[PDB]
Amino acid sequence: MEFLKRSFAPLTEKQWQEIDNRAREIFKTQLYGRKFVDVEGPYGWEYAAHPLGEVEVLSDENEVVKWGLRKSLPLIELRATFTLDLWELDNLERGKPNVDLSSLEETVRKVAEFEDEVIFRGCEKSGVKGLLSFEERKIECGSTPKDLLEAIVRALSIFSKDGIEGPYTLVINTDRWINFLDDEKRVEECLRGGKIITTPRIEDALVVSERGGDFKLILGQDLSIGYEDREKDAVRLFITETFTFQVVNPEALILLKF
Amino acid sequence: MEFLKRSFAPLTEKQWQEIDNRAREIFKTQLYGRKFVDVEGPYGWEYAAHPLGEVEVLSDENEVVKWGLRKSLPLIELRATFTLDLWELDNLERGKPNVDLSSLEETVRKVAEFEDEVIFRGCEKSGVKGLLSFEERKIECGSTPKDLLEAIVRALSIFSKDGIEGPYTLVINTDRWINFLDDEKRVEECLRGGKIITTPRIEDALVVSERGGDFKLILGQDLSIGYEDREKDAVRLFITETFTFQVVNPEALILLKF
Amino acid sequence: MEFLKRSFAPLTEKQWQEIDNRAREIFKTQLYGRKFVDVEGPYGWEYAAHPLGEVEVLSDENEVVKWGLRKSLPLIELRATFTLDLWELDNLERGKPNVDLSSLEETVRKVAEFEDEVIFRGCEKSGVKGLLSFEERKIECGSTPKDLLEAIVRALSIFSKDGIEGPYTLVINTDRWINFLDDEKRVEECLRGGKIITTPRIEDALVVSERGGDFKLILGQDLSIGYEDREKDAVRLFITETFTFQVVNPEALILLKF
Ligand SMILES: Cc1cc2nc3c(=O)[nH]c(=O)nc-3n(C[C@H](O)[C@H](O)[C@H](O)CO)c2cc1C
Ligand SMILES: Cc1cc2nc3c(=O)[nH]c(=O)nc-3n(C[C@H](O)[C@H](O)[C@H](O)CO)c2cc1C
Ligand SMILES: Cc1cc2nc3c(=O)[nH]c(=O)nc-3n(C[C@H](O)[C@H](O)[C@H](O)CO)c2cc1C
C-alpha cells in the first residue's frame, strides 16, 4: 500500500492502531447495504471500467465495412479529509485511555450516508439504477397489525410463480415498526426462518430473497486512511475508496407501498 | 440421447448449460403434483402401454374354443416449440450476465398447467380418473376459524377406521387460507406432524396420507429440450416427454367440501 | 476459438487451410503500420476499455465529500462479410490447383485501407489522435535532388537536442521518390544505417526513430475468419477483430512539408 504515504507521518504505530480500530466499528455497524448484497473480490488501484457486453452501431448501412463502439460502466472514486491535533494525540503515550477523537466520527457518518443513498436511489450521471426505481413490482398493504401477515403470504405466492426460492428477509422503516410490535413470532414463522431488518433510510418496506447472485458490488479498493499534510500544529488525513454496483435480476424484489 | 439432435445446433456448450439451468428451476417450483405422489423409474423412448390385468371376453358361449382380448393403458406424448434470437444469445460470450429469455418461460408455464390439469381432473379419451371424481368420499366443513380444527379430527377418525396410517398432509386453496390465518400451530399439532400446502388450482381442500404406494406416476422419458430448425436468423427448439398416471386405493383420500 | 462457429460449416479441412493461407499473405504485405509501431499482447474477446490514469471532478466545492469519474479509451470492433460458391470450392478435391477466389481479396483490401486511415488521421468519435495532427513539429524542404540530404541532417540535429537516439527511418510517398532517384547510397549513409519505406497513403515525407516504446497498438483479438449462413448454394463468411492505438511521446516524430 505504498501509494498511501504512511511512513511520512509523525505518529508512532500505536496511534495508527488506535485510529484504525476506532473507524472499523462504525463501518461495521453503519453499512446496511452489505448485509444481503454480494461482493466481488478486490482488483487493484487502477482498474477503471467494467464490461456489460453490448455493442452500439454507428456506421451507415450501405458500406462494405461496419464498425461500432463497445459499452461499459465507469467506477467511482471518493476522498474526504479531516484534521487532528497533536497534543491530544500525544497524551496517549503518557497513559490516558479515553483520548478525544471528535472530528473522525462526524465524517465517518457522512461517507456511509452518501454510499447508501447511491445504492438505494442511484445517480444518473454514472448511469446506475436504484432499488426504488423498478416501479412495476408493486402490491398493496394496510395498517392494522394483521395486514402484514396477509401481505407476506400474498408476496410469497408471486415469488413461487417464478423460480425464486431460498431464505427470505424483510427490510422496514423504523417508525412503522412501532404499530406492528405486539406480535413478532408470527411474522418470523410466516417467513419460514426469515429475518427482520429495520433502517432509517427508506420510508416503506420491501421483501427480498437471499439465495445468492442477484445483486453485485464491485470494489477496486476498500476504505482506507492516509496522510496529506502538516498545517501548523494539527496533522491532516484523508479516507478513500473506489466502487460500483449492479442489479441483475429485477424479479427477486417486491415493494410493499403502505 | 441421440434422438435429440443436439450436436447439429449452432450453439456453444455454455449456452446449453445456461438454458438447462434456467428451465430446471421453474420445473422444480411449479409442479405441485410430484410432492406427494410416487414415481416409478424411467423405462425408455418406445415403451407404449401399461398392463392392468383384466381380460374381456368376445366369443360366444356354445363353442369348444374361447378367446378374448387383454386390456391396457396407452401413454401420452407431448411437444411444444419456441423461437430464440441469435444476436442476444451471442451477447453472452462478450460478458453480459443478464441475458434475455422471454419466450422460454411463457411456454414453460403452460406445460405445467396442462399436466396438473390432467392429474387433478383426468381426460376421458385416455380413460384416466381424477382425484376430484371419487365423489362418495365427502364430509362437511364450516367457515369460522374453529371449524377446521374440528373437521381434521372428524377426518382422522375415518382414516383410523380402515388401515390407513402414517404421516398426513393437507392441501388447500390459497384464497381460503386467509380467513383461518390467525392460528397455525394448532392446525400443525392436530395433524401430528403434518404439513400444509397451498395451491391456486383447486377451489377447496382435501386431506391425504403419505405412507407410500397409493398414487403412482409412470414415466417413459423425463422432460427434455432439443433442436428443430433454423428459420432466418432465429433458432427454433422444442420440449417434450411421455407419461401416464394411476390411482390404486380410493380410500386414502378425503374431500372436504366447504 | 469456440465463438467462431467453424465446425458447423460444410467444408473439409483442406479448404480451410487454403483460405487461411491465401488471406495471410495479403495481410503480411498490405499493412504498413505494423512495421515500426509496437504491439502489446492479446488479452481476450471481452476486454472493453483501456485506462489513461486521469480523473474528472464533478462535485461542487463547499462539500464534505467529493467525488469524480475515472476516464478511459473504448475499443473498436469490426466485421465484414462475403459469399463464396460451392461448385468451385469443390473442384479442389478433384485436383485443380488454381481455384478461383475473387471476392475474398476485394474486401481484404478494404479492411487494410480502413485501418491505416485510422492510424494516420484518427477518428474523433473514439477520441484518438493521428500522426498528421501534431502540427507544431514542422520543418521545410525543397525539390532539387540535393535538398533531401540537407533536410535529413537538419532533422537529426533537432533529434539530438532531446534524448532521442537509436536507429532512424524515413517514410515517403511513392510518386515523389521518382525525382530523388539517381542517388540512394548517400541517403542511406546519412541516416547512419537507416531504411527507406515508400507508401501510397500520405502525400509527403516524415522521419521517425525505432528505439522502442513511443507508439503502441492494443489488440483484443487478431484478424479472424468465420462462418455465418448458407444462402441457397453459396456459403457466407465473415472477418473480424478489435483494436485501439495510442501515441505516447510527440517528440520522436518530424514532419517535412515539401
Ligand atoms: C510542559 C509542556 C509540555 C508540552 N508538550 C507538548 C507536546 O507533547 N506536543 C506538543 O505539540 N506541544 C507541547 N507543548 C506545547 C508546545 O511545546 C509549544 O506550546 C509550542 O509553541 C506549540 O507549537 C508543551 C508545552 C509545555 C509547557
Ligand atoms: C458490428 C456488428 C456486429 C454484428 N454481430 C452479429 C452477431 O454476432 N450475430 C448476428 O447474428 N448478427 C450480427 N450482426 C448483424 C448481422 O451481421 C447482419 O445484420 C446480418 O444481415 C443479419 O442477418 C452484427 C452487425 C454489426 C454491424
Ligand atoms: C455431373 C454433375 C455434377 C455436379 N456436382 C456438383 C457438386 O459437386 N456440388 C454442387 O454444388 N453441385 C453440383 N452439381 C449441380 C447440382 O447437383 C445441381 O445443379 C443442383 O440443382 C444445384 O443446386 C453437379 C451437377 C452435375 C450434372
Closest CA to C48 of C68, C79, C72, C70: C72
Closest CA to B4 of B169, B239, B209: B239
Distance CA C22, CA A207 (A): 61
HEC profile of chain A: CCCCCCCCCCCCHHHHHHHHHHHHHHHHHHCCHHHCCEEECCCCCCCCCEEEEEEEECCCCCCCCEEEEEEEECCEEEEEEEEEEHHHHHHHHHCCCCCCCCCHHHHHHHHHHHHHHHHHHCCCCCCCCCCCCCCCCEEECCCCCCHHHHHHHHHHHHHHHCCCCCCEEEEEECCHHHCCCCCCHHHHHHCCCCEEEEECCCCCEEEEECCCCCEEEEEEEEEEEEEEEECCCEEEEEEEEEEEEEECCCCCEEEEEC
Phi then psi for A110, rounded to 5 degrees? -65, -35
Which atom number of ligand 2 is nearest to the Cα of residue C78? 1
Distance CA A94, CA B195 (A): 67
Return the C-alpha cell found at C100. 478461383
Closest CA to A194 of A182, A203, A207, A205: A207
How, if at all, do strands A168-173 and A195-199 pair?
parallel
Is the shortest distance between the CB of A90 and ligand 1 below 6 Å? Answer: yes
Instruction: Please give the full DSSP string across chain C, using - where no structure is assigned.
Output: -TTS--TTSS--HHHHHHHHHHHHHHHHHH--GGGTSEEEPP--SS---EEEEEEEE-S-SS-SSEEEEEEEE--EEEEEEEEEEHHHHHHHHHT-SS----SHHHHHHHHHHHHHHHHHH--TTTT---TTT-TT-EEE--SSTTHHHHHHHHHHHHHHHTT--S-EEEEEETTGGGTTTT--HHHHHHTTS-EEEEESS-SSEEEEE-SSSSEEEEEEEEEEEEEEEE-SSEEEEEEEEEEEEEE--TTSEEEEE-
HEC profile of C50-113: EEEEEEEECCCCCCCCEEEEEEEECCEEEEEEEEEEHHHHHHHHHCCCCCCCCCHHHHHHHHHH
Return the C-alpha cell found at A191. 417467513
Burial C31-70, CB ≥16 within 10 A → b, else e: ebbeebbeeeeeeebebbbbeeeeeeeeeeeeeeeebeeb
Which residue in the block uniquely carries the three cell numbers 442489479? A247
Q: Which ligand is nearest to the CA of C89?
A: 3
HEC profile of A16-45: HHHHHHHHHHHHHHHCCHHHCCEEECCCCC
Return the C-alpha cell found at A85. 491535533
Phi then psi for A47, rounded to 5 degrees? -55, 130
CB-neighbour burial class of residue B129 (10 A; exposed 0-12, middle 13-18, buried 19+): middle
Closest-CA residue, ligand 3 atom 3, reads C87
Number of Cβ atoms within 10 Å of the Cβ of A50: 19
Distance CA C199, CA B30 (A): 68
Closest CA to C27 of C79, C105, C92: C105
Q: Which chains touch C (3 or more CB pairs under 8 A)?
A: A, B
Query: Is C114:A99 a contact under the CB 8 Å cutoff?
Result: no
Question: What one-letter code names the amino acid at A77?
Answer: E
- Taking the CA of residue A240 and the nearest CA in chain C, the distance in Å comes to 10
Closest-CA residue, ligand 1 atom 15, reads A87
Instruction: Sort out which chain A residues have CB atoms less than 8 A from C78's CB and list them.
Output: 65-67
Phi then psi for B165, rounded to 5 degrees? -150, -165
CA angle C235, C240, C241 (to 5 degrees): 165
HEC profile of chain B: CCCCCCCCCCCCHHHHHHHHHHHHHHHHHHCCHHHCCEEECCCCCCCCCEEEEEEEECCCCCCCCCCEEEEEECCEEEEEEEEEEHHHHHHHHHCCCCCCCCCHHHHHHHHHHHHHHHHHHCCCCCCCCCCCCCCCCEEECCCCCCHHHHHHHHHHHHHHHCCCCCCEEEEEECCHHHCCCCCCHHHHHHCCCCEEEEECCCCCEEEEECCCCCEEEEEEEEEEEEEEEECCCEEEEEEEEEEEEEECCCCCEEEEEC
End-to-end Cα distance, chain A: 48
Smallest Cβ–Cβ distance between B26 and the set A163, A189, A249 belongs to A163
Phi then psi for A243, rounded to 5 degrees? -155, 170
Distance CA A111, CA A108 (A): 6
Number of Cβ atoms within 10 Å of the Cβ of A22: 14
Sign of the torsion angle spanned by Cα atoms C44, C50, C53, C58: negative
Is the shortest distance between the CB of A92 and ligand 1 below 6 Å? Answer: no
Closest CA to B244 of B75, B111, B88, B114: B75
Distance CA B167, CA B211 (A): 6
Mutational test site, ligand 2, from C79, C111, C239, max ligand atoms within 8 Å of CB: C79
Strand order in the sheet with B205-209: B138-140, B253-257, B205-209, B168-173, B195-199
Virtual CA dihedral for C114, C120, C121, C123, nearest 10 degrees?
50
Burial C141-179, CB ≥16 within 10 A → b, else e: beeeeeebeebbeebbeebeeeebeeebbbbbbeeeeee
Distance CA B90, CA C46 (A): 12
Virtual CA dihedral for A128, A132, A134, A136, nearest 10 degrees?
-170
Distance CA A101, CA A151 (A): 46
Distance CA C167, CA C150 (A): 19
Closest CA to B44 of B228, B217, B242: B242
Phi then psi for A24, rounded to 5 degrees? -60, -35
Return the C-alpha cell found at B195. 404439513
Determine whether the interchain pair C2/B12 forms a contact, defined as Cβ–Cβ distance below 8 Å. yes
Query: Is C26:C106 a contact under the CB 8 Å cutoff?
Result: no
Return the C-alpha cell found at A25. 466499528
Distance CA A161, CA C102 (A): 57
CB-neighbour burial class of residue B65 (10 A; exposed 0-12, middle 13-18, buried 19+): exposed
Within 13 Å and on the Cβ side, how many CA atoms surround A183? Answer: 12
Is the shortest distance between the CB of C90 and ligand 3 below 6 Å? Answer: yes
Virtual CA dihedral for C144, C148, C153, C154, nearest 10 degrees?
70
Distance CA B43, CA B75 (A): 12
Which residue in the block uniquely carries the three cell numbers 476506532? A22
Say how far residue A148 (Cα) sits from the centre of its chain.
Answer: 27
Which atom number of ligand 1 is nearest to the Cα of residue A91? 8
B28 CA to centre of ligand 2 in angstroms: 36
Is the shortest distance between the CB of A233 and ligand 1 below 6 Å? Answer: yes
A89 CA to centre of ligand 1 in angstroms: 12
Return the C-alpha cell found at A226. 492516509
Phi then psi for A51, rounded to 5 degrees? -90, 130
Residue length of chain B:
258
Distance CA C48, CA C73 (A): 9
**Method used to obtain the model:** cryo-EM
A71 CA to centre of ligand 1 in angstroms: 58
Strand order in the sheet with B234-247: B38-40, B215-230, B234-247, B76-85
How, if at all, do strands A215-230 and C76-85 pair?
unpaired
Is the shortest distance between the CB of A19 and ligand 1 below 6 Å? Answer: no
Instruction: Sort out which chain C residues have CB atoms less than 8 A from A66's CB and list them.
Output: 78-80
Determine whether the interchain pair A70/C75 forms a contact, defined as Cβ–Cβ distance below 8 Å. yes
Distance CA A60, CA B46 (A): 55
A80 is in an annotated binding site: yes
Distance CA B203, CA B257 (A): 9
Which residue in the block uniquely carries the three cell numbers 492494443? C218
CB-neighbour burial class of residue A196 (10 A; exposed 0-12, middle 13-18, buried 19+): middle
Q: Which residue of B lies nearest to A70 if distances are taken between CA atoms? A: B94
Distance CA A11, CA C243 (A): 49
Instruction: Sort out which chain B residues have CB atoms less than 8 A from C45's CB and list them.
Output: 93-94
End-to-end Cα distance, chain C: 48
Smallest Cβ–Cβ distance between C66 and the set A47, A53, A79 belongs to A79
Phi then psi for C111, rounded to 5 degrees? -55, -50
Which value in Å is the resolution of this experimental model?
A: 3.5
Which atom number of ligand 3 is nearest to the Cα of residue C232? 23
Instruction: Sort out which chain C residues have CB atoms less than 8 A from B13's CB and list them.
Output: 2
Query: Is A227:A1 a contact under the CB 8 Å cutoff?
Result: no
Return the C-alpha cell found at C151. 533536410
CA angle C191, C193, C197 (to 5 degrees): 70
Closest CA to A32 of A208, A213, A237: A208
Phi then psi for B13, rounded to 5 degrees? -65, -25
- A240: β partners: A79, A224
Closest-CA residue, ligand 2 atom 4, reads C79
CB-neighbour burial class of residue A63 (10 A; exposed 0-12, middle 13-18, buried 19+): exposed
Query: Is A143:A258 a contact under the CB 8 Å cutoff?
Result: yes
Distance CA A208, CA A256 (A): 11
Radius of gyration of chain C (CA): 24
Is the shortest distance between the CB of C86 and ligand 3 below 6 Å? Answer: yes
End-to-end Cα distance, chain B: 48
Virtual CA dihedral for C114, C116, C120, C123, nearest 10 degrees?
30
- Taking the CA of residue B253 and the nearest CA in chain C, the distance in Å comes to 55
B25 CA to centre of ligand 1 in angstroms: 70
- Tell me how far apart the 2 most distant CA atoms of chain C are, in Å: 81
Return the C-alpha cell found at B208. 391425504
Q: Which chains touch A (3 or more CB pairs under 8 A)?
A: B, C
B90 is in an annotated binding site: yes
Determine whether the interchain pair B95/C3 forms a contact, defined as Cβ–Cβ distance below 8 Å. no
Closest-CA residue, ligand 3 atom 11, reads C87
Return the C-alpha cell found at C92. 479442389
B81 is in an annotated binding site: yes
Burial B172-206, CB ≥16 within 10 A → b, else e: bbeeeeeebeeeeeebeebbeebeeebeeebeebb
Distance CA A179, CA A144 (A): 8
Which residue in the block uniquely carries the three cell numbers 471528535? A102
